[PDB]
Structures are given as C-alpha cells and as structure tokens.
Amino acid sequence: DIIIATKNGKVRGMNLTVFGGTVTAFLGIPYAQPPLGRLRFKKPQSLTKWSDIWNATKYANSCCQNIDQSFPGFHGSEMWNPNTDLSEDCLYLNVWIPAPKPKNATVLIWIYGGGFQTGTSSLHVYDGKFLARVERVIVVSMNYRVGALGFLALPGNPEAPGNMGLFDQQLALQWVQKNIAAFGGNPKSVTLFGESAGAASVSLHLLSPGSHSLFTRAILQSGSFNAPWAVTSLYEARNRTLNLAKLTGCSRENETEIIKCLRNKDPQEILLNEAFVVPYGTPLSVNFGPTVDGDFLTDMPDILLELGQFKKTQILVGVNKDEGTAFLVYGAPGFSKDNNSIITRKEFQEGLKIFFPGVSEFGKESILFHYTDWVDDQRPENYREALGDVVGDYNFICPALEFTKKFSEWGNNAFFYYFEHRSSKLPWPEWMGVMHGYEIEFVFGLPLERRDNYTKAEEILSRSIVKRWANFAKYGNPNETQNNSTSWPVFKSTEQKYLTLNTESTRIMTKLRAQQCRFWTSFFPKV
Ligand SMILES: CCN(C)C(=O)Oc1ccc(O)c([C@@H](C)N(C)C)c1
Ligand SMILES: *[C@@H]1O[C@H](CO)[C@@H](O)[C@H](O)[C@H]1NC(C)=O
Ligand SMILES: *[C@@H]1O[C@H](CO)[C@@H](O)[C@H](O)[C@H]1NC(C)=O
C-alpha cells in the first residue's frame, strides 16, 4: 500500500510492474475546482481540502472536445482520440513515481498537444511509467481545457478572458510546486515537455511571468508559440466568440450576457458549433487558441521573443522530418492514406488554397515558385512531396528554428534535434515518412518493451533519447555519456548545429532548411 498526504488531502496510488521493477502511479488527482456551471469559461479556482483518501487508481475524465472521426477503426487516427469519458469535470493530473520512493527526483511535466482543441493526458503514448522506471524521474501530466471551453476570448472580461486552458496548465504547475516533495520529487528541478500545441504551450510558459518560478527547463517537440497556428489574434478571437454566439442563438448586447447565455448551453452544442466559427478548417485550424489576454500573455509573443522578455534557461527543441504529411489527408485534394497520393500541379495549387486560406494569389504563387522547380521534372511524386514540405516547413521547422535562434541570442544554451526515424509499426502509408507525432512514443520509451514488435534498433534509439531527455532535465545537457554517443552541441545563432535522431547514423548537421526558411521567415510574412 502507498498513500501520500498532499496539501489538500490524502491520495492513494497503485503499484505497477514495469521491466521487472515497480512504478507507483497516482492517476487522476484533481488540481482545481471542476470548471462547471458559473465556473465554465473562467480561470480555474483553487481546490478545497478533503478529509477522506482520494483514490487515484484510474485515469480521470478527459475534457470535452470534438473527436477525429475521419478514419473510423483506423489505429493511426484513433490512437489520439480520448480514451476516458469526456466531461467538463476534467481538471486532473497524473504522477508516476519510481519505486522505491526517490529522495530528490527530477520532475518531467508533460503537456499534450492537439491544436488546443483536443488531447488528453491518458493516451497510451503519454504513459509515464517507463520514464519513471528507467530513469528514476517523476513524470507528471495534466488535463487542461481545450476548444472554446478552454480558450473562448472576450479580452478583458473575466467571464471569458481567454487562455483558460493555459491557466489550467499553470495551476497544475503550482500543484507540483506545492506537493511533489511529498512524492519524493524536487520542486527545484522541474522540466516541462510537450508536443505540438503542448510544445507551443511550453514556449508560452517561458514567456509568462506567472510561470517563471514554476519550472526549471523546457523541451519543445514539434511546436512553438511563433508557429502560424499557435496564437489567435484578438481580432479573430473576437469575431470567433461572436460567430459562435450567433450559431448558438446567444447573440446579446451586454457582452457578459453572451457568456451567461453560453453558460446554459450544453457542452455538445458548444462543441458542434465550434467547428463552424472559421469558414473552412483543418487540424492546423486552431479555432479557439491562446490569445494576448494581458494576464497570461502581457504582449504579443513575437515582441517578447524579439526583445528577450522570457525566462532565461536551457531549451531543447526539435522537429520531425515529415511534419507536414499527416495534415494532407485532412483536406488536400487527391491525397489519401490508402493510395500513394500522386497529385498534379493543379491539385498542389488547390492544396495551397486549403492550407493558406486568406493568402493572396501572389502569396500562393511565391510558394509554388520556391517549391516547384525540380531536378527531374518527371518524378511523379514531385507535387506530392512539395506540398508536404510546404506544410511542414511553414508550420513547424522554420518556426522551431526561428524560436531557437531568437531564444539562444540572449545567452542560454539550446539544443536542436531533427527526428528522422519512421516507426517500424507506423500504421500510416510509407509516403508520409517520419510523421508529426511519431517521435513521442520514442520519447516516452514505448520501444523499450521487447514484447511490442519494435525492432531492436528502435529499442536502442528510444533508450538513447530517453537518456538524453532525462539528462537534459536533470543536468541541463542532453548528452548520452556512456555508450560512446555523438556529442550534442549547443545551437548557436551563427553555426546553427543540430543533432539528427535515427537508427542508423547520429550526425551533427548545420543550418536545417536554410533556403526554405529564408523564404518562410523573412519574405513570406510580408504577403
Ligand atoms: C478539432 C477537430 N479535430 C478532432 C482535430 O483537429 O483532431 C486532430 C488534432 C491534431 C492532429 O495532429 C490531428 C491529426 C493530423 N494527427 C494524425 C492526430 C487531428
Ligand atoms: C479506495 O479503494 C479501496 C480499494 O482497496 C476501497 O477500499 C476504498 O473504499 C476506496 N475509497 C473510496 C473513497 O472509494
Ligand atoms: C533537494 O534539493 C534542494 C535544492 O536546494 C535541497 O534544498 C534539498 O535539501 C534536497 N533534498 C531534499 C531531501 O529536499
């Protein structure tokens, strides 16, 4: 038996067998008053004590959210769908502790992605038990509100001030600060790591004064706040709050009345109209996302980055080789997970109109000009590959590199990775390559299960990544020192060295996508 006394009450965990060892799991501890009723759309409120023993022996409810039903019964999509009951009562977190109980263990706090509209901490690929057993770190992860329930913005008005889900994350970080020592954790050695919107969230915690003292270091997997999809403008946040009001018959005068009207709509009705507040959408469409609210975010984040207004600490940042491909089968004409998706020049151009909705004719022509002058003009995959390269560079690689340049220019050590291994078990077709999201299982050490049909090379890659992430969290330096590994140099603004992650050949390279990112970060934002 294992029972820990926390500031708000006692909680009991459960023992798990992992790799001939033991991990102690506390699944579904609450960290806020459930955001129900008059608390919907507001910032999370503190938790009042409890006298009993909270039973933290199963994952809690996922937050209300729309589900991806584009491929029913397909594991490639459905492995990301919520695996616990949806509910507005979803502000819970999980804690994996090594066994026996550590003394001063470094803490890894996971923030899931999902475009700020979906996601849950209970996904199988976020299972922290492997990291706790292998590296003896504590792993925490939390559920935070998503979609309009998490990011509906009327800027200023405290009934719907925006960024509520970010404040959910922040309140969970406070909980670790006040309670993780009871579990054998070091509140002074806390590393946040996160993928996609989770990584963007981590990047925003770096910017947010209220988060400065809640963590030590930061890891950003395939995401950062300067990604095109990551921050809703206050203009469109307003148009979107108003549009959602009209679709639900909640249009009012007194802006607060709109909120009270939405506070009596059913979660499902809010959810089903969320989709329509933008004209057309893709998973890169982030209808309700982070906003400049004057509270969590005191100014436009691009300005805070430019001017060094952020927490000074080490960062680990990276991207996958084919970030873009996954999104093409959610709208790009002529793509499918079930053919090899040879598209034509005209399908390519149609694809641009979907991924760059309000961009001028000339904007789209400059994209095609830069990406469609080939070596062999006859290679049938030309346009298929270029559209994936366009989406990934624009949405992921160039923002990640831009964030890492600007962040490192203020003196801090930064390490950049380029994840190049396609999972042997990957259920999506070969043409999508090293997909967005499919480094996560290697980070969480799933391939360390020999029982699980991962190749032996994948076990080694995971073992190394896990050691580098842990050493980064413990020591600020993502090196694997024993097994004679390539040393991971710091990313500096002149040489821009980065580390490739693969089963074959761990190489040091420089100036990832130099040509393409000059297009995207220098020229394109003017159009
Ligand atoms: C908000 C509407 N819905 C349900 C949605 O956006 O679901 C997502 C979100 C992120 C995402 O990356 C993906 C695809 C490309 N991944 C392979 C999981 C689907
Ligand atoms: C917690 O779980 C144990 C199972 O051993 C049970 O005896 C106890 O009643 C549970 N407590 C609550 C509050 O459900
Ligand atoms: C854990 O680390 C902190 C860092 O200063 C230190 O104060 C403390 O003594 C360490 N050990 C324990 C058991 O808290």
Coordinates of C-alpha atoms and ligand atoms in Angstrom, one line a residue:
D1 CA 0.0 0.0 0.0
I2 CA 1.1 3.6 -0.9
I3 CA -0.7 6.7 0.5
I4 CA 0.7 10.2 0.2
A5 CA -0.6 13.2 2.1
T6 CA -0.9 16.3 0.0
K7 CA -1.7 19.9 1.0
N8 CA -5.3 19.3 0.1
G9 CA -5.8 15.7 1.4
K10 CA -4.6 12.2 1.3
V11 CA -4.4 10.3 -2.0
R12 CA -3.7 6.6 -2.6
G13 CA -1.9 5.2 -5.7
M14 CA -1.3 1.8 -7.3
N15 CA 1.7 -0.3 -7.9
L16 CA 2.7 -1.3 -11.5
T17 CA 5.2 -3.8 -12.7
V18 CA 7.5 -2.4 -15.3
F19 CA 10.6 -4.2 -16.7
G20 CA 10.9 -6.4 -13.7
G21 CA 10.6 -3.4 -11.4
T22 CA 7.9 -1.3 -9.8
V23 CA 6.4 2.1 -10.6
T24 CA 3.9 3.8 -8.3
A25 CA 1.1 5.6 -10.2
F26 CA -1.3 8.2 -9.0
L27 CA -3.8 8.5 -11.8
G28 CA -6.4 11.3 -11.7
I29 CA -5.5 13.6 -8.8
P30 CA -7.7 16.7 -9.0
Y31 CA -5.9 20.1 -9.0
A32 CA -8.7 22.6 -9.4
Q33 CA -12.4 23.0 -8.6
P34 CA -14.2 21.5 -11.5
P35 CA -15.0 24.3 -14.0
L36 CA -18.7 23.7 -14.0
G37 CA -21.7 26.0 -14.1
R38 CA -20.9 29.6 -13.4
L39 CA -17.2 28.4 -13.5
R40 CA -17.4 27.5 -17.1
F41 CA -15.1 29.8 -19.3
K42 CA -13.4 31.3 -16.1
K43 CA -9.9 30.8 -14.8
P44 CA -9.5 27.7 -12.7
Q45 CA -10.3 28.1 -9.0
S46 CA -8.4 26.5 -6.1
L47 CA -9.3 23.2 -4.5
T48 CA -10.9 23.0 -1.1
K49 CA -9.5 20.3 1.1
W50 CA -10.9 16.8 1.5
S51 CA -11.0 14.6 4.6
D52 CA -11.1 11.2 3.0
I53 CA -8.5 9.4 1.0
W54 CA -8.7 10.2 -2.7
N55 CA -8.4 7.1 -4.8
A56 CA -6.0 7.9 -7.7
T57 CA -6.1 4.4 -9.3
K58 CA -7.6 5.2 -12.8
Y59 CA -7.3 8.0 -15.3
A60 CA -9.9 10.7 -14.8
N61 CA -12.3 12.2 -17.4
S62 CA -10.9 13.8 -20.5
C63 CA -12.1 17.4 -21.1
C64 CA -14.9 17.9 -23.6
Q65 CA -13.7 18.0 -27.1
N66 CA -14.6 17.1 -30.7
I67 CA -13.1 13.8 -31.9
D68 CA -11.4 13.0 -35.1
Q69 CA -13.7 10.6 -37.0
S70 CA -12.0 10.9 -40.4
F71 CA -10.8 7.3 -40.2
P72 CA -13.1 5.2 -38.1
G73 CA -11.4 2.0 -36.9
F74 CA -8.0 3.1 -38.1
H75 CA -5.4 3.0 -35.3
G76 CA -3.4 5.8 -36.9
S77 CA -6.0 8.4 -36.1
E78 CA -7.9 6.7 -33.2
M79 CA -4.8 6.2 -31.0
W80 CA -5.1 10.0 -30.5
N81 CA -8.8 10.1 -29.6
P82 CA -9.8 10.4 -25.9
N83 CA -9.7 7.1 -24.1
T84 CA -11.7 8.2 -21.0
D85 CA -15.1 9.8 -20.5
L86 CA -15.4 13.3 -21.8
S87 CA -16.7 15.7 -19.2
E88 CA -16.4 19.3 -18.1
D89 CA -15.1 18.0 -14.8
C90 CA -11.6 17.1 -16.2
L91 CA -9.0 19.2 -14.3
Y92 CA -7.0 16.3 -13.0
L93 CA -3.3 15.3 -13.2
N94 CA -1.2 12.1 -13.0
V95 CA 2.0 11.3 -11.2
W96 CA 4.5 8.4 -11.9
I97 CA 7.0 7.9 -9.1
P98 CA 9.9 5.4 -9.2
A99 CA 9.9 2.6 -6.7
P100 CA 11.3 2.7 -4.2
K101 CA 10.3 6.3 -3.5
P102 CA 13.0 8.6 -4.7
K103 CA 14.7 11.2 -2.5
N104 CA 15.0 14.3 -4.7
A105 CA 13.9 13.2 -8.1
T106 CA 13.8 15.5 -11.1
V107 CA 10.3 16.1 -12.4
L108 CA 9.1 15.9 -16.0
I109 CA 5.8 17.6 -16.7
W110 CA 4.1 16.6 -19.9
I111 CA 1.7 19.0 -21.8
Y112 CA -0.1 17.2 -24.6
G113 CA -0.8 18.7 -28.0
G114 CA -3.9 18.6 -30.2
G115 CA -4.1 22.1 -31.6
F116 CA -5.6 23.4 -28.3
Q117 CA -8.9 21.7 -29.4
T118 CA -8.2 18.0 -28.5
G119 CA -6.0 15.9 -26.4
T120 CA -5.8 14.1 -23.1
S121 CA -3.1 13.1 -20.7
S122 CA -4.3 9.4 -20.5
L123 CA -3.2 8.4 -24.0
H124 CA -1.1 5.3 -24.1
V125 CA 1.7 7.1 -25.8
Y126 CA 1.9 9.5 -22.8
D127 CA 2.3 6.7 -20.3
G128 CA 4.9 8.0 -17.8
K129 CA 5.6 4.6 -16.2
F130 CA 8.5 3.8 -18.5
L131 CA 10.4 7.0 -17.8
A132 CA 9.9 6.7 -14.0
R133 CA 11.3 3.1 -14.0
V134 CA 14.2 3.5 -16.4
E135 CA 15.5 7.0 -15.4
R136 CA 14.0 7.4 -11.9
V137 CA 12.4 10.7 -12.8
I138 CA 9.0 11.6 -11.7
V139 CA 6.5 12.2 -14.6
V140 CA 3.5 14.5 -14.2
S141 CA 0.9 15.2 -16.8
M142 CA -2.4 17.1 -16.6
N143 CA -5.7 17.6 -18.4
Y144 CA -6.3 21.1 -19.4
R145 CA -9.4 22.6 -21.0
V146 CA -9.4 22.7 -24.8
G147 CA -11.5 24.3 -27.5
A148 CA -13.9 27.1 -26.7
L149 CA -14.3 25.8 -23.1
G150 CA -10.6 26.4 -22.8
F151 CA -9.8 29.5 -24.9
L152 CA -13.0 31.5 -25.6
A153 CA -11.9 35.1 -25.5
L154 CA -13.6 38.3 -24.6
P155 CA -10.3 40.2 -23.9
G156 CA -10.6 41.8 -20.5
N157 CA -13.9 40.4 -19.4
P158 CA -13.3 37.9 -16.6
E159 CA -16.3 35.7 -17.6
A160 CA -14.3 34.6 -20.7
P161 CA -10.9 36.2 -20.5
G162 CA -9.1 33.7 -22.8
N163 CA -6.2 31.3 -22.2
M164 CA -8.1 29.4 -19.5
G165 CA -6.5 26.1 -20.6
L166 CA -3.1 27.7 -20.2
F167 CA -4.2 28.8 -16.8
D168 CA -5.2 25.2 -16.1
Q169 CA -1.7 24.1 -17.0
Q170 CA -0.3 26.9 -14.8
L171 CA -2.4 25.8 -11.8
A172 CA -1.1 22.2 -12.3
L173 CA 2.4 23.6 -12.3
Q174 CA 1.7 25.3 -8.9
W175 CA 0.4 21.9 -7.6
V176 CA 3.7 20.2 -8.5
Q177 CA 5.5 23.1 -6.8
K178 CA 3.5 22.7 -3.5
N179 CA 3.1 18.9 -3.5
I180 CA 5.7 17.0 -5.4
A181 CA 8.2 16.8 -2.5
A182 CA 5.6 14.6 -0.7
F183 CA 6.1 12.2 -3.6
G184 CA 9.9 12.3 -3.4
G185 CA 10.2 15.0 -6.1
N186 CA 12.4 18.1 -6.4
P187 CA 10.3 21.2 -7.0
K188 CA 13.6 22.9 -7.9
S189 CA 14.3 20.5 -10.8
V190 CA 11.1 20.6 -12.9
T191 CA 11.3 20.2 -16.7
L192 CA 8.3 20.9 -19.0
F193 CA 8.0 19.0 -22.2
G194 CA 5.2 19.0 -24.7
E195 CA 4.5 18.3 -28.3
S196 CA 2.7 20.5 -30.9
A197 CA 0.2 22.7 -29.1
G198 CA 1.8 21.3 -25.9
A199 CA 5.2 22.5 -27.1
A200 CA 3.7 25.8 -28.1
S201 CA 2.3 25.9 -24.6
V202 CA 5.7 25.2 -23.1
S203 CA 7.1 28.1 -25.1
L204 CA 4.4 30.4 -23.7
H205 CA 5.1 29.3 -20.2
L206 CA 8.6 30.6 -20.9
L207 CA 7.1 34.0 -21.7
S208 CA 4.5 34.2 -18.9
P209 CA 5.7 35.9 -15.7
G210 CA 3.2 33.9 -13.6
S211 CA 5.0 30.7 -14.8
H212 CA 8.6 31.9 -14.3
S213 CA 9.1 30.3 -10.9
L214 CA 7.1 27.1 -11.6
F215 CA 9.7 25.2 -13.7
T216 CA 13.4 24.9 -14.5
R217 CA 13.8 23.9 -18.1
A218 CA 11.8 23.3 -21.2
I219 CA 11.6 20.8 -24.1
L220 CA 9.6 21.8 -27.3
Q221 CA 8.7 18.9 -29.6
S222 CA 7.3 20.0 -33.0
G223 CA 5.8 23.3 -31.8
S224 CA 6.4 26.8 -30.5
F225 CA 4.3 29.9 -30.0
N226 CA 5.5 31.6 -33.2
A227 CA 4.2 28.7 -35.3
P228 CA 1.5 30.2 -37.7
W229 CA -1.3 28.1 -35.9
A230 CA -0.3 28.8 -32.4
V231 CA -1.8 32.2 -31.4
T232 CA -5.2 33.6 -32.2
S233 CA -5.3 37.3 -32.9
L234 CA -7.5 39.4 -30.7
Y235 CA -9.4 40.5 -33.7
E236 CA -10.3 37.0 -34.9
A237 CA -10.7 35.8 -31.2
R238 CA -13.5 38.4 -31.0
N239 CA -15.0 37.5 -34.4
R240 CA -14.9 33.9 -33.4
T241 CA -16.5 34.5 -30.0
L242 CA -19.2 36.5 -31.7
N243 CA -19.8 34.0 -34.5
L244 CA -20.1 31.2 -32.0
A245 CA -22.7 33.3 -30.2
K246 CA -24.8 33.6 -33.3
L247 CA -24.7 29.9 -34.2
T248 CA -25.9 29.1 -30.7
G249 CA -28.5 31.8 -30.5
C250 CA -26.6 33.6 -27.8
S251 CA -26.1 36.9 -29.5
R252 CA -26.7 39.7 -26.9
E253 CA -25.8 43.2 -26.1
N254 CA -24.2 43.3 -22.7
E255 CA -21.2 41.1 -23.6
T256 CA -21.5 39.4 -20.3
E257 CA -25.0 38.2 -21.3
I258 CA -23.5 36.4 -24.2
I259 CA -21.3 34.5 -21.7
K260 CA -24.2 33.7 -19.4
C261 CA -26.2 32.5 -22.4
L262 CA -23.3 30.2 -23.4
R263 CA -23.1 29.0 -19.8
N264 CA -26.5 27.4 -20.1
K265 CA -25.8 25.7 -23.5
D266 CA -25.0 22.1 -23.4
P267 CA -21.3 21.1 -23.9
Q268 CA -22.3 19.2 -27.0
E269 CA -24.0 22.3 -28.6
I270 CA -20.9 24.5 -27.9
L271 CA -18.8 21.7 -29.4
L272 CA -20.8 21.2 -32.6
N273 CA -20.8 24.9 -33.4
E274 CA -17.1 25.3 -32.5
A275 CA -16.2 23.8 -35.9
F276 CA -18.1 26.4 -37.9
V277 CA -16.7 29.7 -36.4
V278 CA -14.0 29.6 -39.1
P279 CA -15.1 29.3 -42.8
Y280 CA -13.1 26.1 -43.5
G281 CA -10.9 24.1 -41.2
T282 CA -8.1 21.6 -40.9
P283 CA -6.3 20.2 -37.8
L284 CA -3.9 23.2 -38.3
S285 CA -7.0 25.4 -38.0
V286 CA -6.9 26.4 -34.3
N287 CA -10.3 28.0 -33.9
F288 CA -10.0 28.7 -30.2
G289 CA -6.4 29.1 -29.1
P290 CA -4.0 31.1 -27.0
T291 CA -4.6 34.8 -27.1
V292 CA -2.9 38.0 -25.9
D293 CA -5.0 38.5 -22.8
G294 CA -3.0 40.9 -20.7
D295 CA -2.8 38.3 -18.0
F296 CA -1.1 35.0 -19.0
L297 CA 0.4 36.8 -22.0
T298 CA 1.2 40.5 -21.4
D299 CA 2.0 41.4 -25.0
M300 CA 2.3 39.9 -28.5
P301 CA 4.7 37.0 -28.0
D302 CA 6.7 37.8 -31.2
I303 CA 7.7 41.0 -29.4
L304 CA 8.6 39.3 -26.2
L305 CA 10.8 36.9 -28.1
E306 CA 12.4 39.6 -30.1
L307 CA 13.3 41.6 -27.0
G308 CA 14.5 38.9 -24.6
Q309 CA 11.4 39.1 -22.3
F310 CA 11.4 35.5 -21.3
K311 CA 12.7 33.0 -18.6
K312 CA 16.4 32.5 -19.0
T313 CA 17.1 28.8 -19.0
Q314 CA 18.1 25.9 -21.3
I315 CA 15.8 24.7 -24.0
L316 CA 15.7 21.5 -26.1
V317 CA 13.8 22.0 -29.4
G318 CA 13.2 19.7 -32.3
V319 CA 11.1 18.7 -35.3
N320 CA 10.4 15.6 -37.3
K321 CA 11.4 15.0 -41.0
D322 CA 7.9 14.9 -42.4
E323 CA 5.9 17.2 -40.1
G324 CA 3.6 18.2 -43.0
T325 CA 2.4 14.9 -44.4
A326 CA -0.2 13.9 -41.7
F327 CA -2.3 17.1 -42.4
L328 CA -2.6 16.5 -46.2
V329 CA -5.1 13.7 -45.8
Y330 CA -7.4 16.0 -43.9
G331 CA -8.4 18.1 -46.9
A332 CA -5.7 18.3 -49.6
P333 CA -7.4 17.3 -52.9
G334 CA -6.1 14.0 -54.3
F335 CA -4.4 12.8 -51.1
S336 CA -5.4 9.6 -49.2
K337 CA -3.8 7.4 -46.6
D338 CA -4.8 4.4 -48.9
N339 CA -3.1 5.4 -52.2
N340 CA 0.3 6.8 -52.7
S341 CA -1.2 10.2 -53.4
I342 CA 0.5 11.3 -56.7
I343 CA -1.1 14.7 -57.1
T344 CA -0.9 17.0 -60.1
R345 CA 0.3 20.6 -60.3
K346 CA -3.3 21.7 -60.2
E347 CA -4.0 19.6 -57.1
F348 CA -0.9 21.1 -55.5
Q349 CA -2.3 24.6 -56.2
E350 CA -5.7 23.6 -54.8
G351 CA -3.8 22.3 -51.7
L352 CA -2.3 25.7 -51.1
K353 CA -5.8 27.4 -51.1
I354 CA -6.7 25.0 -48.3
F355 CA -3.6 25.4 -46.2
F356 CA -3.2 29.2 -46.8
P357 CA -6.9 30.3 -46.8
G358 CA -6.6 34.1 -46.8
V359 CA -3.3 34.4 -48.6
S360 CA -3.3 36.4 -51.9
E361 CA -3.0 34.9 -55.3
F362 CA 0.6 36.2 -55.4
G363 CA 1.4 34.7 -51.9
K364 CA 0.4 31.3 -53.2
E365 CA 2.4 31.8 -56.5
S366 CA 5.5 32.6 -54.5
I367 CA 5.0 29.3 -52.5
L368 CA 4.7 27.4 -55.8
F369 CA 7.7 29.2 -57.3
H370 CA 10.0 28.3 -54.4
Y371 CA 8.9 24.7 -54.0
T372 CA 8.2 23.5 -57.6
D373 CA 11.4 23.9 -59.7
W374 CA 12.6 20.3 -59.6
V375 CA 15.7 18.3 -60.6
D376 CA 13.7 15.6 -62.7
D377 CA 10.5 17.4 -63.7
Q378 CA 9.0 14.0 -64.4
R379 CA 9.3 12.3 -61.0
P380 CA 5.6 11.6 -60.3
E381 CA 5.8 12.4 -56.6
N382 CA 7.1 16.0 -57.2
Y383 CA 3.9 17.8 -56.3
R384 CA 3.0 15.3 -53.5
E385 CA 6.4 15.8 -51.8
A386 CA 6.4 19.6 -52.2
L387 CA 3.0 20.0 -50.6
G388 CA 4.2 18.1 -47.5
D389 CA 7.5 20.0 -47.5
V390 CA 5.5 23.3 -47.7
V391 CA 3.2 22.5 -44.8
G392 CA 5.9 21.2 -42.5
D393 CA 8.4 23.9 -43.2
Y394 CA 5.8 26.7 -42.8
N395 CA 4.0 25.2 -39.8
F396 CA 6.9 23.6 -37.9
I397 CA 10.5 23.6 -39.0
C398 CA 11.1 27.3 -39.7
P399 CA 9.1 28.5 -36.6
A400 CA 11.1 26.0 -34.4
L401 CA 14.4 27.2 -35.8
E402 CA 13.3 30.8 -35.6
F403 CA 12.3 30.4 -32.0
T404 CA 15.6 28.6 -31.2
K405 CA 17.7 31.4 -32.9
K406 CA 16.0 34.2 -31.1
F407 CA 15.9 32.3 -27.8
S408 CA 19.6 31.5 -27.9
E409 CA 20.6 35.0 -28.9
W410 CA 20.1 36.0 -25.2
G411 CA 22.8 33.8 -23.9
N412 CA 21.1 30.5 -23.0
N413 CA 22.1 27.0 -24.1
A414 CA 19.8 25.5 -26.7
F415 CA 19.8 22.1 -28.3
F416 CA 18.1 21.3 -31.6
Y417 CA 17.2 17.9 -32.9
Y418 CA 15.9 16.6 -36.3
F419 CA 14.0 13.4 -35.7
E420 CA 14.4 11.1 -38.8
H421 CA 13.2 7.7 -37.8
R422 CA 9.9 6.3 -39.1
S423 CA 8.4 3.8 -36.6
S424 CA 8.6 0.2 -37.9
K425 CA 5.0 -0.2 -36.6
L426 CA 3.6 3.1 -38.1
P427 CA 0.1 2.4 -39.4
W428 CA 0.1 5.3 -42.0
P429 CA 1.4 4.8 -45.5
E430 CA 5.1 5.0 -46.4
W431 CA 4.8 8.2 -48.4
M432 CA 4.1 10.2 -45.2
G433 CA 7.5 9.2 -43.9
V434 CA 8.6 10.4 -40.4
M435 CA 5.3 11.8 -39.4
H436 CA 4.2 14.5 -37.0
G437 CA 3.6 13.0 -33.5
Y438 CA 5.6 9.8 -34.0
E439 CA 8.6 10.7 -32.1
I440 CA 6.5 10.8 -28.9
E441 CA 6.5 7.0 -28.4
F442 CA 10.3 7.1 -28.6
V443 CA 10.4 9.9 -26.1
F444 CA 8.2 8.0 -23.7
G445 CA 10.2 4.8 -24.1
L446 CA 7.5 2.6 -25.5
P447 CA 10.0 0.7 -27.7
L448 CA 11.8 -0.4 -24.6
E449 CA 9.0 -3.1 -24.4
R450 CA 10.6 -6.0 -26.2
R451 CA 7.1 -7.6 -26.1
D452 CA 5.8 -5.0 -28.5
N453 CA 7.1 -5.6 -32.1
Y454 CA 9.5 -2.7 -32.2
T455 CA 12.8 -3.6 -33.9
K456 CA 16.0 -3.9 -31.8
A457 CA 17.4 -0.8 -33.4
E458 CA 14.3 1.1 -32.3
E459 CA 14.8 -0.1 -28.7
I460 CA 18.3 1.4 -28.8
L461 CA 17.1 4.7 -30.3
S462 CA 14.4 5.0 -27.6
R463 CA 16.9 4.1 -24.9
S464 CA 19.2 6.9 -26.0
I465 CA 16.5 9.6 -26.5
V466 CA 15.2 8.8 -23.0
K467 CA 18.6 9.2 -21.5
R468 CA 19.2 12.5 -23.4
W469 CA 15.8 13.9 -22.3
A470 CA 16.4 12.8 -18.7
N471 CA 20.0 14.2 -18.6
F472 CA 18.6 17.3 -20.1
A473 CA 16.0 17.6 -17.3
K474 CA 18.4 16.6 -14.5
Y475 CA 21.5 18.4 -15.8
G476 CA 20.6 20.9 -18.5
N477 CA 22.6 19.0 -21.0
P478 CA 21.1 16.3 -23.4
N479 CA 24.2 14.2 -23.8
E480 CA 24.4 10.4 -23.5
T481 CA 27.8 9.9 -21.9
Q482 CA 28.5 6.3 -21.5
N483 CA 27.6 4.3 -24.6
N484 CA 30.0 6.4 -26.6
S485 CA 27.5 8.6 -28.4
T486 CA 27.7 11.6 -30.7
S487 CA 28.0 14.7 -28.5
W488 CA 25.1 17.1 -28.9
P489 CA 26.5 20.6 -29.5
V490 CA 24.6 23.7 -28.4
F491 CA 22.7 25.5 -31.1
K492 CA 24.2 29.0 -31.6
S493 CA 22.9 31.7 -33.8
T494 CA 25.9 31.6 -36.2
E495 CA 26.7 27.9 -36.8
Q496 CA 23.3 26.5 -36.0
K497 CA 24.4 22.9 -35.4
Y498 CA 21.7 20.4 -34.8
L499 CA 21.6 16.7 -33.9
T500 CA 19.8 14.0 -36.1
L501 CA 18.0 11.2 -34.3
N502 CA 17.8 7.9 -36.3
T503 CA 18.5 4.2 -36.1
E504 CA 21.5 4.4 -38.4
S505 CA 23.8 7.3 -38.0
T506 CA 23.6 10.1 -35.4
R507 CA 25.1 13.0 -37.2
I508 CA 25.8 16.7 -36.5
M509 CA 24.5 19.0 -39.3
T510 CA 24.2 22.7 -39.7
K511 CA 21.5 25.2 -41.0
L512 CA 18.5 23.0 -41.3
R513 CA 16.3 24.1 -44.3
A514 CA 18.4 27.2 -44.7
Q515 CA 17.0 28.1 -48.1
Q516 CA 13.4 27.3 -47.3
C517 CA 13.3 29.1 -44.0
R518 CA 14.7 32.3 -45.6
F519 CA 11.6 32.1 -47.7
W520 CA 9.2 31.5 -44.9
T521 CA 10.5 33.7 -42.1
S522 CA 12.0 36.6 -44.0
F523 CA 9.9 37.0 -47.2
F524 CA 6.6 35.3 -46.8
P525 CA 5.2 37.1 -43.7
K526 CA 5.1 40.3 -45.8
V527 CA 2.4 38.9 -48.2
Ligands
LIG1 C1 -10.6 19.9 -33.6 C2 -11.0 18.8 -34.6 N1 -10.3 17.6 -34.6 C3 -10.9 16.4 -33.8 C4 -8.9 17.5 -34.7 O1 -8.2 18.5 -35.1 O2 -8.1 16.4 -34.5 C5 -6.6 16.4 -34.7 C6 -5.8 17.3 -33.9 C7 -4.4 17.4 -34.2 C8 -3.9 16.5 -35.1 O3 -2.5 16.5 -35.4 C9 -4.6 15.6 -35.9 C10 -4.0 14.6 -37.0 C11 -3.2 15.2 -38.2 N2 -3.0 13.6 -36.2 C12 -2.6 12.4 -37.0 C13 -3.6 13.1 -34.9 C14 -6.1 15.6 -35.7
LIG2 C1 -10.5 3.3 -2.4 O1 -10.1 2.0 -2.8 C2 -10.2 0.9 -1.8 C3 -9.9 -0.4 -2.5 O2 -8.9 -1.2 -1.8 C4 -11.6 0.9 -1.1 O3 -11.5 0.0 0.0 C5 -12.0 2.3 -0.7 O4 -13.3 2.3 -0.2 C6 -11.9 3.3 -1.8 N1 -12.3 4.6 -1.4 C7 -13.2 5.4 -2.0 C8 -13.5 6.7 -1.4 O5 -13.8 5.0 -2.9
LIG3 C1 16.7 18.7 -2.7 O1 17.2 19.8 -3.4 C2 17.1 21.0 -2.7 C3 17.8 22.1 -3.6 O2 18.3 23.1 -2.8 C4 17.7 21.0 -1.3 O3 17.4 22.2 -0.6 C5 17.2 19.8 -0.5 O4 18.0 19.6 0.6 C6 17.4 18.5 -1.4 N1 16.9 17.3 -0.7 C7 15.7 17.1 -0.1 C8 15.5 15.8 0.6 O5 14.9 18.0 -0.1

